[PDB]
Subunit: 292 residues, 4 copies
């Protein structure tokens, strides 16, 4: 639910750019079959940026329905305005989602005090578990360990998706929070390392197209079988890297289509179709993982 | 008008975080009297992030009304979803604004091709002049000179607010575009250097509180009197730096309150009030500028 | 010998800037008593930059003598000219040192091919074990894992001191080299993490003044007792950080004097005496570690 | 002479890596005929790193002899140990050189106070004019404008080669120093911008192969004819960038060989021969410049 391999699931679209219900069902069945621990619905990989709040909510509710109690669903609820983050969060109160993934405000670059006040206010307007999400290369700001420790004192703030790729954060945060605060990687290429350092899992892009391997890798990691896990990680490493050869989720949506998991690889502008060079790059990474 | 000193104006708020018409009127009278070339309404400094589109529109319309033809108004119209950017632009058709300031999509990190398609689509569906806006430290992406060159060929894409603070961009862009394409600094601390290299003005935070000096400095720069302009810049430099000692627009709103230009220095979360240390830093910068 | 806690030992000086034999003896006895695994003589922390090759060699030979077979000694042998690195290395052939610590050429920024040719040539002129040393913030270049794997095929190239602070390097290098290739941290603040990821020890600055704790921490780490080790690491973390409050080895030399381990904290220009603020900072970190 | 186009001259070598007098003569005749203001002998581009002090001295003396009063010679005298820098400077007293180019200590990363004491001590023990040299990407340290300001008060510290490529440094330094303190670019790609902001010339790698164009460009810049200068800069820009496609001076020595200016393109390790891909890149840049 908040450990193991969690997929940051794509929002499959038809050629018109609207959610494709048949493709979403196919993906969710695949994750249930694959042993994926949970689904993050309309996070970064799910094109939260280009979906309006109504469309965002429709996708989450549809995912919840299709999941049909077979796998937990976490809604993406991040916003760079606190009032807006509260409003979006309130849409999913009493919905059936098990928690929220809420990113540090992007673009307006709040202070550490501002981040504290932002997340505290959000948590105070919901009973839903809150997972913080730090990704400075996308947001322009960096939620530091000290502020994480401060927020972890709030009752329903229960974990962090740490996507810096800076592995020193694991033990910097861990020593500042209680033993049941969840530490999740948001960086596929360093996620096994993250887990070896004491992390509890990964919210993953790679898991969209290698769900079984990812689930297997995180199981081995949790059991301390890191050498065995590294064999899988090595098989997956080219995808960990090349799924960002062009901006996420352009590569992973193409990979889904290629594996027959979705009907179309359509995205919304300003995301654009994958280049020819990108195709071959991603195809080779799929081949290396033994999926094509 | 798209040259000289252009103010990225604050959106002055009462204690409930709602637009204060009386303070806004005062600021606009101040800029008319101080020789400011134009007003950017609801840009980054105007808290575009924490205003909804209705409020955003209201502020712009109120700004136009109060300006009453005495000073040109440019609307912030940027969005990280192309469809949203387009529809926000439609709100201002035949409103009376002279142009739009439109930022590179933030948070979703489109490719150069994606940025091209984004701005081309926006420009397609309006007659309004478009000023591109690059600020990688806030957005997570960087509109490179090559792409600015491609976009400058679009009839109503007329200029760029370049806020990297990387001065090599001035002539990299200039050689790729026509002589009437406007190059504007979005980094106060390097804006005079920017103009000396060939830039045509600045979209300024400092101009909020040092409007006359900024107008004069920019005019001198345009006339090639860089030594004379630089004496003014030296007095203003502490302000250029310290107006970002805490997240913009926290320091500049406090400065406006201290000068009596606005009733309150209230912002919306996740912006928080200025620290005591910040007050002292900014106050010292204001005195260095001869404003207090 | 090439695992556990290895000290990058200071070169204690008299007020005239020459090696202080009594202080060096005191330090070496302290490391023998403390359980330090080995000494690195005239590395970065030993002021290799400001000692000429004759003085460098005198210090190494003196350290060897004073060690008197009680603790292994590794000579610093790095140089940014390959011929110069060979010459320096040859001075210690048949000396009694157990190996060499050789840094990537600094200042002239060689390619990965250049680094390969540099280290290969050096290794070919000695029977002594060679430990590569990567520290891009000091050298201006970065020896990447792929090139490390390539060099690890050379018989007497047996390990790396990895001082990037980038923990992803551990498993990137490990998968490219044989199981007996040694992986050592060159970054005190991340060294336990480094070991938890599969590293075999640390070449340490902190160990100069907390040798017993460091030796104890690395023992626990090697035995897999990481939680117990973290208690020590937490006690030492302020030293891990504050021993670089001013340029290394200015802080650690002052700390040695303060603990009575050396007679004077004298350095050679361009290193300068510790500031008053630096003193108090380092004193507080010593207090936190329970040493003062 | 410390203005205009100053060449950071290669040290041409035979196939054994020894200085080639005949090639050096050719280069010097070339620079006398091409209007180059001065020659920097055994700077970074002259492979200062892999020449010993005797060879270093020999090259400078040979350069002075060959120049035969027709062009001023500046000696590279930088070292990361103050004592070494001082004694290297003494080798050139009454040699006939007009000044020294002395880099910030590399690898040992002194503080600003350390840099101050370093250069002050060097300047104390000579009558020769001293040109400071800042290049953080190579040295690991950054001589900031404040410290340049302090150092400029020393009688015979007369200028700075600023190689950050950060153009804000021009006027940050200029406002802290006297009007006759010389500001020279050490970054070819931004050198014209640098001069347009107030800089007095460039110490150039490009000038090795494009001496006449560089002389003319710099003269135009000094006369304020930036548009005219910039036409030349545009032809040279590929060369400005691609002469660093592989580590300097690998590309520029190859270019010199290709033009017939030197007999061989041989370097000393850890510099290695140019790759085939590099040949093609540099050759295309030379043709763009109209040199082939
Ligand atoms: K909690
Ligand atoms: K245009
Ligand atoms: K080996
Ligand atoms: K002077």
């Amino acid at each position: 639910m908040f450990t193991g391999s969690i997929v940051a699931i794509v929002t499959p679209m038809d050629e018109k750019g609207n959610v494709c219900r048949a493709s979403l069902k196919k993906l969710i069945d695949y994750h249930v079959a694959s042993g994926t621990s949970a689904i993050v619905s309309v996070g970064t990989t799910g094109e939260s940026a280009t979906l309006n709040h109504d469309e965002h909510a429709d996708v989450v509710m549809m995912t919840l329905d299709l999941a049909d109690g077979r796998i937990p669903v976490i809604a993406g609820t991040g916003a760079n305005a606190t009032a807006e983050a509260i409003s979006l969060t309130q849409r999913f109160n009493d919905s059936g989602i098990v928690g929220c993934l809420t990113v540090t405000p992007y673009y307006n670059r709040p202070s550490q005090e501002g981040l504290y006040q932002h997340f505290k206010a959000i948590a105070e307007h919901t009973d839903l578990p809150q997972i913080l999400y730090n990704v400075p290369s996308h947001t322009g700001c960096d939620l530091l360990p000290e502020t994480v420790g401060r927020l972890a004192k709030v009752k329903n703030i229960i974990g962090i998706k740490e996507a810096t790729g800076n592995l020193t954060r694991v033990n910097q945060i861990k020593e500042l929070v209680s033993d049941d605060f969840v530490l999740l990687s948001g960086d596929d290429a360093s996620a096994l390392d993250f887990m070896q350092l004491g992390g509890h899992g990964v919210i993953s892009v790679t898991a969209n197209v290698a769900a079984r391997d990812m689930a297997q890798m995180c199981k081995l990691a949790a059991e301390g079988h890191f050498a065995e896990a590294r064999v899988i990680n090595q098989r997956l490493m080219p995808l960990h890297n090349k799924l960002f050869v062009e901006p996420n989720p352009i590569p992973v949506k193409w990979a889904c289509k290629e594996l027959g998991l979705v009907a179309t690889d359509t995205l919304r502008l300003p995301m654009t179709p994958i280049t020819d060079s990108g195709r071959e790059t991603v195809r080779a990474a799929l081949k290396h993982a033994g999926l094509l």
